[PDB]
PDB file of C-alpha atoms in Angstrom:
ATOM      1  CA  UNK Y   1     -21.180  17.276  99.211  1.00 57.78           C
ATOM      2  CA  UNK Y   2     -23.065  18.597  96.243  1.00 57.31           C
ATOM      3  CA  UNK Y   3     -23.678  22.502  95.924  1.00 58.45           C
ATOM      4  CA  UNK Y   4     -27.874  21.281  96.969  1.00 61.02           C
ATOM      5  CA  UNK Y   5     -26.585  19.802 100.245  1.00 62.44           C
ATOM      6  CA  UNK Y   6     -25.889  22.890 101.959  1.00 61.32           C
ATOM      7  CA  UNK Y   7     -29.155  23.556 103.817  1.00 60.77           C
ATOM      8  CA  UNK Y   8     -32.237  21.904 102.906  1.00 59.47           C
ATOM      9  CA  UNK Y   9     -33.420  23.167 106.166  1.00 62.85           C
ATOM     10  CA  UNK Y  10     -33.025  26.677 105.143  1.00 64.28           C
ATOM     11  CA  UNK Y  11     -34.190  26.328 102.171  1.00 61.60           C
ATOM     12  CA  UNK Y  12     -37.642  24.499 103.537  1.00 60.09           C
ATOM     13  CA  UNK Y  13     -38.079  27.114 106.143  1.00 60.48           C
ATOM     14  CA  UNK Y  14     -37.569  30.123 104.003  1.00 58.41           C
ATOM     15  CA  UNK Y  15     -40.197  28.694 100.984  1.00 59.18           C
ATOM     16  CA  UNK Y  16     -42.598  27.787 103.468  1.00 59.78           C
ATOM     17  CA  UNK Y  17     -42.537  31.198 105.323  1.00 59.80           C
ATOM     18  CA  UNK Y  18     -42.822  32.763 101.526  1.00 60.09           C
ATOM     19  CA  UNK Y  19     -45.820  30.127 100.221  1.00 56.82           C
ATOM     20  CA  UNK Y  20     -47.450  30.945 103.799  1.00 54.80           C
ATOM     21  CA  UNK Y  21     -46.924  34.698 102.808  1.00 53.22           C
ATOM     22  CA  UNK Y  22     -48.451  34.475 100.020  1.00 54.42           C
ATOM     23  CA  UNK Y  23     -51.270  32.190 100.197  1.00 53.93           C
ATOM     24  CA  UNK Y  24     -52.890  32.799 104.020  1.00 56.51           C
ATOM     25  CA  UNK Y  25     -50.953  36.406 103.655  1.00 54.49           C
ATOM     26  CA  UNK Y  26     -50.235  35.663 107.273  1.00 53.66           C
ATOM     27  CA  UNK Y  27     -47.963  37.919 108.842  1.00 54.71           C
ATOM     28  CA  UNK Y  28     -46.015  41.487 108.067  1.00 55.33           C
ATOM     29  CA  UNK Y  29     -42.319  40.612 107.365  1.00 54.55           C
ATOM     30  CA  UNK Y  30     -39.205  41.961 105.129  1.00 55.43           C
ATOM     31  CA  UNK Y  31     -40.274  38.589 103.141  1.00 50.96           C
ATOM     32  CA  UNK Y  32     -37.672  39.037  99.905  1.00 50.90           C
ATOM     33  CA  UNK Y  33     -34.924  37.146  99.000  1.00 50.42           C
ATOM     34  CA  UNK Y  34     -34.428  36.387  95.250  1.00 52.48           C
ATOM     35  CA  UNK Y  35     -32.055  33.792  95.920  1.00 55.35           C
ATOM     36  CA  UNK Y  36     -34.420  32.162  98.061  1.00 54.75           C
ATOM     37  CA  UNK Y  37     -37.200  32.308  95.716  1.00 53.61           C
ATOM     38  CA  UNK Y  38     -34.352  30.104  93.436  1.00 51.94           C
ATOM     39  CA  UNK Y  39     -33.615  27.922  96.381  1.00 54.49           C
ATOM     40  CA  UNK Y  40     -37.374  27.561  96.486  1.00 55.49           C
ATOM     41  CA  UNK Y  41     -37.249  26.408  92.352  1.00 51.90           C
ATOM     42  CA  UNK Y  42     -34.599  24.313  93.419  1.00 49.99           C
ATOM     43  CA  UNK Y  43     -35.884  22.572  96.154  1.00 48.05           C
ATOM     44  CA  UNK Y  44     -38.363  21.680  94.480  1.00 45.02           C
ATOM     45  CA  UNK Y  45     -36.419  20.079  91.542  1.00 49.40           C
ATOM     46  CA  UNK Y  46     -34.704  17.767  94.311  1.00 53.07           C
ATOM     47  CA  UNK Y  47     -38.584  16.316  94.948  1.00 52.42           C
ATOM     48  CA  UNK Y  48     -40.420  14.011  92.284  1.00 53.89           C
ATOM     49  CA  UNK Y  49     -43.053  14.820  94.911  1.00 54.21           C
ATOM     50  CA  UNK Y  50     -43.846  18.669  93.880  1.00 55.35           C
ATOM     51  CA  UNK Y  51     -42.787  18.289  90.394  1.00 55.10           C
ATOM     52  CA  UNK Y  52     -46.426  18.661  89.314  1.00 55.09           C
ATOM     53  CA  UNK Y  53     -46.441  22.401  91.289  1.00 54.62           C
ATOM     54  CA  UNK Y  54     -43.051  23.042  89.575  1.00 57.37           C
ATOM     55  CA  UNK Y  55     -44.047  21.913  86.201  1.00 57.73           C
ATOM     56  CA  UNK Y  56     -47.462  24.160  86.853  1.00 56.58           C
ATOM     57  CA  UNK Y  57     -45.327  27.104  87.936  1.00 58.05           C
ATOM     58  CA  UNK Y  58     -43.453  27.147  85.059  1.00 59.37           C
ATOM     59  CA  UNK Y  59     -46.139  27.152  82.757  1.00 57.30           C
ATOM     60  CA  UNK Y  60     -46.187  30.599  83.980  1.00 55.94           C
ATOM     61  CA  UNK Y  61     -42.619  31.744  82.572  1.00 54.82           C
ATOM     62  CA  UNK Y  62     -44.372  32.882  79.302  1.00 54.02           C
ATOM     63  CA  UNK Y  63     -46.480  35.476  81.474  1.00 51.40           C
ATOM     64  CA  UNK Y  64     -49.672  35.029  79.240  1.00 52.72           C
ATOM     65  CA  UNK Y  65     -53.409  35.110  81.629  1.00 50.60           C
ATOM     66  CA  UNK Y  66     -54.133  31.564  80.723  1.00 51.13           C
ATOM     67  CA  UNK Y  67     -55.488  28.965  83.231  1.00 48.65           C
ATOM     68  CA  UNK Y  68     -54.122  25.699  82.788  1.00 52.33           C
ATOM     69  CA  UNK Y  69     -56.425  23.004  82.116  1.00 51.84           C
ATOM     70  CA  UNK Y  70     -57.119  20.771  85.225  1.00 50.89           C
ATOM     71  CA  UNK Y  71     -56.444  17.171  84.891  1.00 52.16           C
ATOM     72  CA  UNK Y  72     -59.170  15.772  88.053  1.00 52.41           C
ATOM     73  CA  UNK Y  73     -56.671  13.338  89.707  1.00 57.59           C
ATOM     74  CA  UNK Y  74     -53.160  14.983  89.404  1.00 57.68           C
ATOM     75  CA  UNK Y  75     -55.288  18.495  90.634  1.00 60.05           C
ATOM     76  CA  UNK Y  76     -56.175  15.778  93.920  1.00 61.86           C
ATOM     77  CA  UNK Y  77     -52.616  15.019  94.361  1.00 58.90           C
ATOM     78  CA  UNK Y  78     -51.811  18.494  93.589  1.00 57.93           C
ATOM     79  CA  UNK Y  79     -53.773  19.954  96.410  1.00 62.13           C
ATOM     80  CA  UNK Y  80     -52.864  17.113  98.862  1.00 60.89           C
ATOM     81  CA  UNK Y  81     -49.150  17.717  98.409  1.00 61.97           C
ATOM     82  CA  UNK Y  82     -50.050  21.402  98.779  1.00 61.22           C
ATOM     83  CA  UNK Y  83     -51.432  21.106 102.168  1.00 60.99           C
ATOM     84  CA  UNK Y  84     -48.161  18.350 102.869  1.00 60.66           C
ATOM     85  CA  UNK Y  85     -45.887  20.729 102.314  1.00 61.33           C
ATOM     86  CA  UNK Y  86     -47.591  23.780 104.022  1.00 64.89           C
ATOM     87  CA  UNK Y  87     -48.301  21.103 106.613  1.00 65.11           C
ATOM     88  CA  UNK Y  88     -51.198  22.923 108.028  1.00 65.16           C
ATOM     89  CA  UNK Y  89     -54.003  20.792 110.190  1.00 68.30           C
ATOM     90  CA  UNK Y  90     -56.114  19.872 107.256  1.00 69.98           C
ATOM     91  CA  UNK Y  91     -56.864  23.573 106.848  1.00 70.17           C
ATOM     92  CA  UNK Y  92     -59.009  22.545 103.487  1.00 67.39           C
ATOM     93  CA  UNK Y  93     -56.471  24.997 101.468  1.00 65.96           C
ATOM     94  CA  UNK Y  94     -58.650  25.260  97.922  1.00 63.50           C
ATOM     95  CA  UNK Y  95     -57.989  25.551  94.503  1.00 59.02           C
ATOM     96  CA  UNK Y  96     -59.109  29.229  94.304  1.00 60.06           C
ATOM     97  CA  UNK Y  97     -56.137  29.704  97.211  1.00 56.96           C
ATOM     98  CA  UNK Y  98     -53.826  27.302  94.524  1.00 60.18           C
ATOM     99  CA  UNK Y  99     -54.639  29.535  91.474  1.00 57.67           C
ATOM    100  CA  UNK Y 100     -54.319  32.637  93.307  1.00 56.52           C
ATOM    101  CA  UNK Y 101     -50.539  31.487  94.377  1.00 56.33           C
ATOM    102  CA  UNK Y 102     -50.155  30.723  90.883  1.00 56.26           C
ATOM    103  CA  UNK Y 103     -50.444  33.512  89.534  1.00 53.06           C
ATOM    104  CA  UNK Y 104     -48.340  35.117  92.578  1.00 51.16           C
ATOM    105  CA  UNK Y 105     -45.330  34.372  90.372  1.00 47.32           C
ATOM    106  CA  UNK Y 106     -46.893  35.585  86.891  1.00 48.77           C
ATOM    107  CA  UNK Y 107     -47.499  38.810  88.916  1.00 48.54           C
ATOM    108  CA  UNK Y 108     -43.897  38.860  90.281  1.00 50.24           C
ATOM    109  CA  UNK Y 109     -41.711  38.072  87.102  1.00 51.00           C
ATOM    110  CA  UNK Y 110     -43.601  41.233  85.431  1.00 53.33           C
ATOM    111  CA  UNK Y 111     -40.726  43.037  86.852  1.00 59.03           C
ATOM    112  CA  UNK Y 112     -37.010  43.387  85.899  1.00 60.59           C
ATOM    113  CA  UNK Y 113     -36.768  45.695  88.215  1.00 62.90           C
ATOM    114  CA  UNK Y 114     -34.504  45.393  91.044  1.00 62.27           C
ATOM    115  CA  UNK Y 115     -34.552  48.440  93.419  1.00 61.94           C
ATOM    116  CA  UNK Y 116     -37.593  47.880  95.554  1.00 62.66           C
ATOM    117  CA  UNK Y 117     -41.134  48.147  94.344  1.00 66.45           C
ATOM    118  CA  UNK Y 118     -43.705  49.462  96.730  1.00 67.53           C
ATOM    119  CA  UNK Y 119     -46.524  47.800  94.621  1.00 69.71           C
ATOM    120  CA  UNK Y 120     -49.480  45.696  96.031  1.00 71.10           C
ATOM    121  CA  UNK Y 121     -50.899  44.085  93.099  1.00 73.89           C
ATOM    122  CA  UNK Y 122     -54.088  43.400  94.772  1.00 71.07           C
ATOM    123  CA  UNK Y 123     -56.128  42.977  91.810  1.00 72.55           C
ATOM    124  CA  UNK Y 124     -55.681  39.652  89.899  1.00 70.91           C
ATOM    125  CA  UNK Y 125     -56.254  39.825  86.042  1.00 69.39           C
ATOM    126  CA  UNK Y 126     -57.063  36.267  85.811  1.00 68.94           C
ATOM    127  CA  UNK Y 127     -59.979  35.617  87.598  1.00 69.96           C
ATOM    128  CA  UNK Y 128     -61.687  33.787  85.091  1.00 70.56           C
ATOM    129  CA  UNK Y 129     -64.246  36.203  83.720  1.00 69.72           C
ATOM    130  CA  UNK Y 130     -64.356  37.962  80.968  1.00 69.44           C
ATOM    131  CA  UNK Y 131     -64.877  41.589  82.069  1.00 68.63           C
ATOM    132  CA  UNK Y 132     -65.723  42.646  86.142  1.00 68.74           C
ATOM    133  CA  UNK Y 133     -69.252  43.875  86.760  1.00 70.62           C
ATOM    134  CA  UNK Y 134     -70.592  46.031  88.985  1.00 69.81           C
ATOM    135  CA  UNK Y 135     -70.964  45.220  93.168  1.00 69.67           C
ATOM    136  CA  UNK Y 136     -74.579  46.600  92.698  1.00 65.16           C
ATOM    137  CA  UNK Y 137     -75.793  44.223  90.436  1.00 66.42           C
ATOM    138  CA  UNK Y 138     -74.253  41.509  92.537  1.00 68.74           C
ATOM    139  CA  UNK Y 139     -76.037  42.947  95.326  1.00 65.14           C
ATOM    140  CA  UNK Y 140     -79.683  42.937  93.795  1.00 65.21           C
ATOM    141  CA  UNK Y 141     -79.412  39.326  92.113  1.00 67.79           C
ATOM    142  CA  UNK Y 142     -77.933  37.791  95.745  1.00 67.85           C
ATOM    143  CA  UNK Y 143     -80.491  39.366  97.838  1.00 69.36           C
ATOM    144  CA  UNK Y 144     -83.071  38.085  95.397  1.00 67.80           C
ATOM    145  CA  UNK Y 145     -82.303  34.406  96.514  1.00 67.01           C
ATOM    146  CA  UNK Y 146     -81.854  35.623 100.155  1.00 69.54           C
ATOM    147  CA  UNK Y 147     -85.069  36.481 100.794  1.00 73.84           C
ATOM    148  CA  UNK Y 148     -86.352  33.367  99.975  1.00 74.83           C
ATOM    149  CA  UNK Y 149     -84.340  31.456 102.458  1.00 75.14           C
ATOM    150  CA  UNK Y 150     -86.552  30.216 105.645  1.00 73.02           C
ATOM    151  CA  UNK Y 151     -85.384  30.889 108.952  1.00 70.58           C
ATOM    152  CA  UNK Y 152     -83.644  28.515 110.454  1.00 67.82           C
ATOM    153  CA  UNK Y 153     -83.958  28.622 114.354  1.00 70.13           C
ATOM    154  CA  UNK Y 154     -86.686  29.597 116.814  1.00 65.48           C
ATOM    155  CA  UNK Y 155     -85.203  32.450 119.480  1.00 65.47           C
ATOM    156  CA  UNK Y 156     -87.196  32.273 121.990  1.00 62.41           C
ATOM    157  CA  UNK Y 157     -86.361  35.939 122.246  1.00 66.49           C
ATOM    158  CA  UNK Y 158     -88.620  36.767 125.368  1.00 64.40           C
ATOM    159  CA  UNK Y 159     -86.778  38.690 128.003  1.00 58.60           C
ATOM    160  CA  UNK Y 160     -83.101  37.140 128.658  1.00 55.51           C
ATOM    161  CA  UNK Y 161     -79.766  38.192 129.639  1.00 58.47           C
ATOM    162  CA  UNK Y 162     -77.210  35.807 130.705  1.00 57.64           C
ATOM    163  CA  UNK Y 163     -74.281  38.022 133.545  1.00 56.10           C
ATOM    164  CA  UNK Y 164     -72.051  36.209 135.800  1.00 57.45           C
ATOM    165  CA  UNK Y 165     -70.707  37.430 139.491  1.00 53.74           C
ATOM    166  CA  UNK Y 166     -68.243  35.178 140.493  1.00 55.82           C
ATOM    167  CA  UNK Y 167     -65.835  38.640 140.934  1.00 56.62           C
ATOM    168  CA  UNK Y 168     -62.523  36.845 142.357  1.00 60.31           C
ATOM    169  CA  UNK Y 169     -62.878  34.629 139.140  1.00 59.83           C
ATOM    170  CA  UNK Y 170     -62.710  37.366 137.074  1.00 54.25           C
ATOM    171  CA  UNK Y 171     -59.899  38.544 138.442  1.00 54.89           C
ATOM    172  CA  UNK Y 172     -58.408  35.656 138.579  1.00 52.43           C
ATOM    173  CA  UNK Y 173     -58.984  35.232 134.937  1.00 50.85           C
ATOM    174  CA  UNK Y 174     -57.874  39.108 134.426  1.00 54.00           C
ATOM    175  CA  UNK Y 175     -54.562  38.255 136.379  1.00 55.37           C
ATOM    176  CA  UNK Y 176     -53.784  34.979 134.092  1.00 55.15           C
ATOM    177  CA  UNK Y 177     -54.589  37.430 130.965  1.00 60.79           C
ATOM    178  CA  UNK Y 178     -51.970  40.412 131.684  1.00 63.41           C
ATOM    179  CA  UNK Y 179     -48.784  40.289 130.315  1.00 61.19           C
ATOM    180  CA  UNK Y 180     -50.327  40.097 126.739  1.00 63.40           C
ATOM    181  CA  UNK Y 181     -49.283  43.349 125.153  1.00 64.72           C
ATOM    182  CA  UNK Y 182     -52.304  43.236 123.341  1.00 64.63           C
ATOM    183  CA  UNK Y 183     -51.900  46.968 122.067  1.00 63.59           C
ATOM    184  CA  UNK Y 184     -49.255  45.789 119.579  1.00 65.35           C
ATOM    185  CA  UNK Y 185     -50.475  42.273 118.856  1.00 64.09           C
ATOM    186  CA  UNK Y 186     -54.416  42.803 117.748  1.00 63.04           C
ATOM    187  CA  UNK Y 187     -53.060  44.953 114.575  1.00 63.51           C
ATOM    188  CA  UNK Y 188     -52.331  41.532 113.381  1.00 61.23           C
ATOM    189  CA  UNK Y 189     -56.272  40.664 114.135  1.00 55.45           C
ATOM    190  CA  UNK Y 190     -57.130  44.009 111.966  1.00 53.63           C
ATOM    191  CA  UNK Y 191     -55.219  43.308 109.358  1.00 52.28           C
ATOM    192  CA  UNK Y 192     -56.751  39.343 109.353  1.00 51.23           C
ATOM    193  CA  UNK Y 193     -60.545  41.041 108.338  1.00 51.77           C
ATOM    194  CA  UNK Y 194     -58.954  43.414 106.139  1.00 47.76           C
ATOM    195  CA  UNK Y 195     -57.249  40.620 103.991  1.00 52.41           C
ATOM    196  CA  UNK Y 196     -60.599  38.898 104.731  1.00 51.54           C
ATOM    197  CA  UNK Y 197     -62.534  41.741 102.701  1.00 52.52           C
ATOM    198  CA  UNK Y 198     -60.459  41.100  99.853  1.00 49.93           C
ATOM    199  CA  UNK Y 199     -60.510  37.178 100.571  1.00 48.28           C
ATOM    200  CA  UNK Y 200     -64.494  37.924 100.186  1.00 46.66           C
ATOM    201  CA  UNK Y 201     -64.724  37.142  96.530  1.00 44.97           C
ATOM    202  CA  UNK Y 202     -62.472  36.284  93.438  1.00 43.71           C
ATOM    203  CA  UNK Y 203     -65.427  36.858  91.256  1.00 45.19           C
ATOM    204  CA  UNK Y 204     -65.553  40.622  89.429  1.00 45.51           C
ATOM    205  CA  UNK Y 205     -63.776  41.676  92.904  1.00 43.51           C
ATOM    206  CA  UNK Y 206     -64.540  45.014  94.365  1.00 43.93           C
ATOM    207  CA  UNK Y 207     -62.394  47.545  92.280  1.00 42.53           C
ATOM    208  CA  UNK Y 208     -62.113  50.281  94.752  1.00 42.70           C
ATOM    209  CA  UNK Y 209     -61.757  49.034  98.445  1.00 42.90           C
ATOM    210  CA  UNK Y 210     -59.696  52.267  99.753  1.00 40.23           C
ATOM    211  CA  UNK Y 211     -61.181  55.454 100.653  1.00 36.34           C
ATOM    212  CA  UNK Y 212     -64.324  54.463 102.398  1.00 36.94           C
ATOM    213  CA  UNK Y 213     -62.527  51.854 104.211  1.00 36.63           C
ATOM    214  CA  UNK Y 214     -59.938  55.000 105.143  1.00 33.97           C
ATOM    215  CA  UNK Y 215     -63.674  56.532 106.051  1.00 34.57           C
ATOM    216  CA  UNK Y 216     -63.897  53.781 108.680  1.00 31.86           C
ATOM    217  CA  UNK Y 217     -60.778  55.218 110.852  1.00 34.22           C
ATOM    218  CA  UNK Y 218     -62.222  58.338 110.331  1.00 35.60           C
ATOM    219  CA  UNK Y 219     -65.086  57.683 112.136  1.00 39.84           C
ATOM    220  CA  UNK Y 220     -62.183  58.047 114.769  1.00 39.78           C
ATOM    221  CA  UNK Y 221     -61.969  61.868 113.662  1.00 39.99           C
ATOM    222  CA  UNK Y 222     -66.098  62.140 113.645  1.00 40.68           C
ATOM    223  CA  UNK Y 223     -65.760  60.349 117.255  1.00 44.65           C
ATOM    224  CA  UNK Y 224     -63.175  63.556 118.588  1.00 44.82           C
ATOM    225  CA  UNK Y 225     -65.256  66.327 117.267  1.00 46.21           C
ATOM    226  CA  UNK Y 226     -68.281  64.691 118.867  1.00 43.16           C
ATOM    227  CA  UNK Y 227     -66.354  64.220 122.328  1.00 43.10           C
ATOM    228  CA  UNK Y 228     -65.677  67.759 121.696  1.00 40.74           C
ATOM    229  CA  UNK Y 229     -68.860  69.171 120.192  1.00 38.52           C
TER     230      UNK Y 229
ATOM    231  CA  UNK K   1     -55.845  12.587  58.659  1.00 42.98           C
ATOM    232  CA  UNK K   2     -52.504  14.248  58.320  1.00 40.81           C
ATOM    233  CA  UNK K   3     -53.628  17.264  60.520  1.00 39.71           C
ATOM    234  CA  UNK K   4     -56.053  16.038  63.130  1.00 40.74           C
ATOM    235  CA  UNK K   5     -53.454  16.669  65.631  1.00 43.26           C
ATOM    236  CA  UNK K   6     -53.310  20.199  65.496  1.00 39.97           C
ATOM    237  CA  UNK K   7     -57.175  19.619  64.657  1.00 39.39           C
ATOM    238  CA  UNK K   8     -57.901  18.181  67.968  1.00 37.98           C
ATOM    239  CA  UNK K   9     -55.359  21.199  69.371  1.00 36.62           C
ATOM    240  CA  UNK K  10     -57.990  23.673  67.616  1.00 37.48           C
ATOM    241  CA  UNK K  11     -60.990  21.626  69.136  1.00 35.60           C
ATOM    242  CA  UNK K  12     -59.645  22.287  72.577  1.00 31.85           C
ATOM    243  CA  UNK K  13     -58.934  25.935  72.033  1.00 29.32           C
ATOM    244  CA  UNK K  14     -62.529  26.082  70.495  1.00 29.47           C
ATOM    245  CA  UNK K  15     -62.833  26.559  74.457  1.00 33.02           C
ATOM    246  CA  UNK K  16     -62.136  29.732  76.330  1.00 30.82           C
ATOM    247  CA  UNK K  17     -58.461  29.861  75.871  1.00 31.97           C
ATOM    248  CA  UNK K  18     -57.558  26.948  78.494  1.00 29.82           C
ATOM    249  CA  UNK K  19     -53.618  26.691  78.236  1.00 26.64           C
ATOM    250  CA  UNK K  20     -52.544  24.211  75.106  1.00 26.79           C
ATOM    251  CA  UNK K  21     -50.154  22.082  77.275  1.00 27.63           C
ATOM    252  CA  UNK K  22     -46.584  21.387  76.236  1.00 26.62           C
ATOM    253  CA  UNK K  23     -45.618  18.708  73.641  1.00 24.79           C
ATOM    254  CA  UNK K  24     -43.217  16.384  73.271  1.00 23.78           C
ATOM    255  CA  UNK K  25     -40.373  17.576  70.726  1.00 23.36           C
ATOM    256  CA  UNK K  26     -41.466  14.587  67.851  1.00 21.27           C
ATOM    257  CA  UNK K  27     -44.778  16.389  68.477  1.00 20.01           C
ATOM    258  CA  UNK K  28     -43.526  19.629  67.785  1.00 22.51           C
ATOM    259  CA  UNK K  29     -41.418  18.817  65.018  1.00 22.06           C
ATOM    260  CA  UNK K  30     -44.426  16.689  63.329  1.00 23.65           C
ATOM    261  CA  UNK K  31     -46.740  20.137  63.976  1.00 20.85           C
ATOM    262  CA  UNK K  32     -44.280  22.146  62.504  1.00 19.94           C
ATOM    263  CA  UNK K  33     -43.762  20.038  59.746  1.00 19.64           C
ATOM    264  CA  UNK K  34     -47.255  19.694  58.794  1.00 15.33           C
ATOM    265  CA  UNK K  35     -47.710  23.341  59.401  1.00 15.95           C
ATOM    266  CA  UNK K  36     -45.100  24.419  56.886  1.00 15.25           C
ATOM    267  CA  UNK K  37     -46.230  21.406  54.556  1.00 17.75           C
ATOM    268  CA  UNK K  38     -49.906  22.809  54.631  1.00 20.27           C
ATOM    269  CA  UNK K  39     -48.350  26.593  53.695  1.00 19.30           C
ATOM    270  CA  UNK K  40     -45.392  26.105  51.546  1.00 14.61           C
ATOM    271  CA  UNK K  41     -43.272  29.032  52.739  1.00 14.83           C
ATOM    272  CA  UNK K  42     -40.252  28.346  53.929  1.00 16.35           C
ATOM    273  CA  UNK K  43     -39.308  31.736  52.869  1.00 15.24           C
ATOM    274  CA  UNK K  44     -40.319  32.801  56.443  1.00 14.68           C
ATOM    275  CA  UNK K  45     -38.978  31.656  60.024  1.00 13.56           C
ATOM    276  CA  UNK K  46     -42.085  29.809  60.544  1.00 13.31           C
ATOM    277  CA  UNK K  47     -42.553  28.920  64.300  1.00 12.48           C
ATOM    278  CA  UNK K  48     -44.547  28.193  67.311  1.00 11.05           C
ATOM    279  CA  UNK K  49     -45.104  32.584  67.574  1.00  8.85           C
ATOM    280  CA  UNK K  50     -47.235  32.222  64.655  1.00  7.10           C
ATOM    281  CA  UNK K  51     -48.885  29.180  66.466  1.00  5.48           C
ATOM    282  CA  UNK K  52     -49.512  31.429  69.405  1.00  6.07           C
TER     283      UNK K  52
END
């Protein structure tokens, strides 16, 4: 009858959809609830299973950069029971994934403020470096090792095209694909690869990301004037 | 010998600032015990802020 009986259901769901959030950074949603994020604290508490994760999120309550030292094992049991609780298909969820949720929270208790906040902390301050460097220089010393790399398959690459006739098949096919309202639903597919180009590196990430990746959509603009000299 | 504690605390941190984990509170009281006891002034709040 206690005061934690009232809906571990709701609580589950609710943390999950919030760790999902945060971690894959699946889906758009009005994801907020303070008192969630407690019942989240709290459902943990009622686990000996997740202690570790709480004990590691609380480190964070002082605020300060740090990265705790790992401890092999417990890290092991720490990312199993990770994965348990997200209780994705062995989606080999990583510790870079772990740290960044981490220090989701150290980002988030920042604020006392209580209005709304707009803010995407994209950056993370912790990554484990002492100062970001340049993309350039990142560029030369990679491409360095590239071109040493030996291919690794033979194309044939002699004259080939592969095409397919079987017309009432494709319609067929077309038929079983049309109720999709694909319209609305790829935005979700764009906004997978732009997560991805942040998801590219946690090492001296890309400081500016925004206005020639606005430049790409513009294209759409360069696209018009050519359609209309 | 009466330090090596806090030594060994020092040896860790002689590493790029890894998080000092939490102690138990004999531990804490026996570090700030040995802390005051190695500077003599109590005339000052002296605490775990200094330690950090």
């Amino acid at each position: 009858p206690s005061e934690e009986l009232i809906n571990m259901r709701r609580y589950r769901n609710a943390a999950r959809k919030l760790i999902h959030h945060y971690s894959l950074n699946s889906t758009s949603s009005t994801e907020y609830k303070i008192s969630d994020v407690v019942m989240t604290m709290i459902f943990l508490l009622r686990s000996e299973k997740y202690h570790s994760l709480f004990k590691l999120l609380e480190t964070t309550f002082d605020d300060y950069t740090c990265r705790p030292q790992m401890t092999q094992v417990q890290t092991d049991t720490l990312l199993d029971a990770v994965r348990s609780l997200l209780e994705m298909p062995s989606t080999t969820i990583d510790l870079t994934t772990v740290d960044i949720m981490r220090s989701s929270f150290a980002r988030c208790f920042n604020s006392p403020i209580m209005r709304y906040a707009k803010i995407v902390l994209l950056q993370n301050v912790a990554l484990q470096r002492d100062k970001r460097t340049t993309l350039e220089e990142l560029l030369i010393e990679r491409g360095e090792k590239i071109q040493m790399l030996q291919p690794q398959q033979y194309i044939n690459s002699g004259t080939e095209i592969p095409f397919c006739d079987d017309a009432e098949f494709l319609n067929r096919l077309l038929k079983h694909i049309d109720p999709y309202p694909l319209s609305r639903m790829y935005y979700n597919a764009a906004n997978t690869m732009f997560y991805t180009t942040m998801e590219n590196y946690a090492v001296s990430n890309c400081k500016f990301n925004i206005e020639d990746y606005n430049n790409i959509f513009k294209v759409m603009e360069n696209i018009r004037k050519h359609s209309n000299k």
